[model samples]
Target chain A: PELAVQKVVVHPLVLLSVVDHFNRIGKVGNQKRVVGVLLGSWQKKVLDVSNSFAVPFDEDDKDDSVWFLDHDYLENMYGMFKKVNARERIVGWYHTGPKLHKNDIAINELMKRYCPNSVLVIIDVKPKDLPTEAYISVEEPTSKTFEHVTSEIGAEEA
Target chain B: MPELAVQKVVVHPLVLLSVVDHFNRIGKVGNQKRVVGVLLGSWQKKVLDVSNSFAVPFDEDDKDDSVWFLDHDYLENMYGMFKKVNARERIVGWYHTGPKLHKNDIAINELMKRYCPNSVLVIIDVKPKDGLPTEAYISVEEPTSKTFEHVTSEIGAEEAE
Candidate 1:
């Protein structure tokens, strides 16, 4: 389906959590980079992002030139989140940057692949001069209700 | 490659800004995620313009709770994507998100090898609201390999304003 990420209603708390993760890392500033994920659900036409957390793989170089994820840890976290409510899913991904650019489209395309209808959230940690909110999604020519979500995982397991 | 003598780690406040904001914005579970970006600047080690991300969840159910696996497919592809831009950008360093590295970070040893023989480890630290975000980088002295140094820190010039 042609996607249109029209409306994005993020919980204030979710933003805070993103902050916590950001603050938690890079205090040292060596080969550090910025990264994280957006977790929430889709309600009808609304994409309600309420939960989020920091993943492990970070770019020690220009853009995580050298980084690895604890898939074991990630899978475990995913399983635990499933308990928060079966509706919760990895809504999308988030990060800090100047603004959105062409490079973003490549990554966004894949996320759009996994979720088909996911919203990309961009936070400007530093702006020479501008707004900090940057959310990019496939414009279905434009958008989701805001509420709970269900995992896209197939029900065949049951 | 030779041992690069580096001093001072420069960072963008937004890295910490986003972490703080994210934590305050969200607080239901402790499941952790991370922020990865390009590390630029110079021989001294600096974090450059960030604009991409991914997710890795943490679980308390494992024997080695500190150990987590980071898949490299997205990262590898990101390199190709970066080149597509006006110029080409190579991997520098990654932002681990916030403070406090666990016993698990040793896993990075594998990643360092995978990325290049001379890989740099930059750790990000997070505190409640003490109000600073910078640390000093340490050296790999002898056998111990050196525990992650207090390393880089923040002056918070922006916050002061």
Candidate 2:
């Protein structure tokens, strides 16, 4: 296979950050979901997502066309985060969802500006068992779908 | 030359998650000075397995160690609930978010002594560069005073996702 990414390596910190973001924003009565960018290094075929921070996003519940994403805030956040750890880059983005939403592709398109072959990670805020999923966009002759990729929690001891 | 093996600190991922969660909830968002939590795990042989933790409400006087305060009542309340969930987990130590200890760390260590006679202290570097994310310490007593000794720490590997 000529895929850009074969597997994803998510750190516990990233999961906790996502969960914390959801706990802060998604649990509120008005907001339907929350979104954030994932930071880590790309090791050959493995996308190691080690760190993440939430972004301010608002969208109309009934209308997919009405939405607001703070690209300026996201850029500034990444700029400050880069000073701390230069090795980490934008590998993907994550949202609190058991499945993909209508405008997910639009968000992924925006993420492509920073990471050409960016991955999409979905976090199950209210988890039953495993609460994470990774995806890569695919376009076949018939339709476009976000294909699932293998992912796991990994650690690097010092 | 022969030397004795040093005891180690084995940290589980859940412990790190809990620490970060606490920081995000109170310390970061609320713009507090620092975040402190009780480390729950087992102490045996050459390793201390720090598997779980809960946040503790804390405040301190910057200039004086004597004026610092920790919510002992809340600590006891949470510890009781934790033990009910898992009897094996006990108070092995405490954790604070920072690259280094504060002036009143020894004072807090003395307070932690009521629960665990020899409580370890872990300083977590929440925004770590390319280095050790955590530093472990055990209080050392000299003839004149008390100090701290550095203990090596490693994260426990998880086989499952």
| Clashes by residue pair, model 2 | none
**Every model's Cα RMSD, please?**
12.8, 12.3
Lowest summed lDDT across 10 adjacent residues in model 1 chain B is found at B49-58
Per-residue CA lDDT of model 2 for A32-117, tens digit only, reads 67788888878779998877766777778888767767787678667645433335788989888878988787788788788987
Cα lDDT tens digits, model 1, B24-143, are 333445535543222322233433222222222223325665546554654554443333321222354444544655465545534633653333444545455543554433335544
**Please, what's the RMSD in Å of model 1?**
12.8
Winning candidate number (TM-score): 2
Lowest-scoring 10 consecutive residues by lDDT in candidate 2 chain B? B21-30
Write candidate 1's Cα lDDT for A1-158 as tens digits.
23345455665445544543454333545233344557766665566676655555433445532444434444555554453333567777666654554444545554554466656666444324422253655333134222212222111100
* Candidate whose lDDT is highest: 2
What TM-score results for chain B in every one of the models? Answer: 0.57, 0.88
Against the true chain A, what TM-score does chain A of candidate 2 give?
A: 0.89
Stretches > 4 Å off in candidate 2: A26-31, A141-143, B1-161
